Design a binder for this molecule. Sequence first.
Ligand SMILES: NC(=O)c1cccn1Cc1ccccc1Cl
Length: 323
Amino acid sequence: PVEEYLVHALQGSVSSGQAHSLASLAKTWSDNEGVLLTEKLKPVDYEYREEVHWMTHQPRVGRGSFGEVHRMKDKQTGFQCAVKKVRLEVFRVEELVACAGLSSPRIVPLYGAVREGPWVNIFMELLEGGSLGQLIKQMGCLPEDRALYYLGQALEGLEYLHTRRILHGDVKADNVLLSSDGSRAALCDFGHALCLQPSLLTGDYIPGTETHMAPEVVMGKPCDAKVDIWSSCCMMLHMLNGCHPWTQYFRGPLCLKIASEPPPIREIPPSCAPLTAQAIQEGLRKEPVHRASAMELRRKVGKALQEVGGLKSPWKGEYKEPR
Ligand SMILES: NC(=O)c1cccn1Cc1ccccc1Cl
């Protein structure tokens, strides 16, 4: 009843505020307005404008698949964080409604969001270790113990999202980000995220990474929290091998082979310990009913880590040649 008025008070300004107000406002995003959740990112006379109140680090350098993520600084407070640019015309409301209010050390904190013209500018904590994706390229591929350690932390973030009926939608090394010493990993990018029930190919849908798609996505069957778990194990194989599943063996339209072919358990390295191999296999079952949940696999993975003597390799050790 007052809902309508609260939304209007938020439009046309940028304000210091809370996550519930950011979400409210973001629902209207299908000139300069938004909500900032930390006093470190501070508006100035109802505004927060790129190149006036905040400055991207120079020269411009772009991380992410679309080069859409930048280091920035609030001109008044000196606070540094990261900004992800999303184009307004393709903005998915779930990207801010999902993460808004979330609080978990396995999920990268959201610091605010400001619309300015054809951009939505999403702010978040800046994690200097970079993406797991860029660790893989830099190191070639990762030791079994480190890969387990990171899969498990991804899976912990997923327990937290899945418990609250949120699907991440594009779990992969590029969307896990690492603290500066490498010991903490955290899920980033709610651009493909989704609010769940206990179909998928309809509406505002942006599909995830093809190589990490589960079969129920691909064949258009009913989908659920289990689709993240498949992805997480494709990511595992990527950490271990230095390449995504499927890319080595099939060349044409990949999504056809994910449907018809057996799951890609042949890509498990043979020098992997028994329980590592088995954990990955249960996360890669083709029917969601037989696939492990986040909680089941996280548990399995944590004992898999224990079974190889725990985490012992240095974070940026020596280069392992890929497959
Ligand atoms: N939340 C982040 O920090 C983030 C999200 C996607 C990539 N990153 C890392 C990153 C982004 C911009 C500038 C420097 C770095 Cl190390």
